[PDB]
Write a protein that binds this ligand. Structure first.
Ligand code: NA
Length: 162
């Protein structure tokens, strides 16, 4: 009955704590929020370059959580590597949207992925109908009761299928 959930890990971790810090607990807390309500189909995407700490230009906290969530079959790392000198990063967003679109679930993020909706009609509509935004207050993960405005549906039904 519950929609599959797909979380933009980077969006969430940046929002949580200092906005200039990749706060891995942000991801834990969001995940737990869905767990507590009964969800079991949950996926969080984060680039794999977040795993390696030898010189992190955006700082990170509680890095170990990523691999923790990987083991529980919740977090999935996204691909990236260095070509010649520089880092190249297969885009997060694509995995996030493609998965949610094809699993017919929801996307948890405050990014609206303007690039992607400019690429494909079907993705634009999906994003409009299926983005779930949120605010954090310290460690409280707070999504809106009215995810699509007063005209759309309640949180509870947004997260169901029928
Ligand atoms: Na943050």
């Amino acid at each position: 009955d519950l929609r599959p959930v797909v979380i933009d890990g980077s969006n969430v971790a940046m929002s949580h704590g200092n906005k200039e810090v990749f706060s891995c607990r942000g991801i834990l807390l969001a995940v737990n929020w869905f767990l507590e309500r009964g969800h079991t189909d949950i996926t969080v995407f984060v680039p794999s370059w977040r795993k390696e700490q030898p010189r992190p230009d955006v700082p990170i906290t509680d890095q170990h959580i990523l691999r923790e969530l990987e083991k529980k079959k919740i977090l999935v790392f996204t691909p990236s590597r260095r070509v010649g000198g520089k880092r190249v990063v297969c885009y997060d967003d694509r995995f996030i949207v493609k998965l949610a679109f094809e699993s017919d679930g929801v996307v948890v993020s405050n990014d609206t992925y303007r690039d992607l909706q400019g690429e494909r009609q079907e993705w634009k509509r999906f994003i409009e109908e299926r983005l779930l935004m949120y605010s954090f207050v310290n460690d409280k993960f707070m999504p809106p009761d009215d995810p699509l405005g007063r005209h759309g549906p309640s949180l509870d039904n947004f997260l169901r299928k029928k």
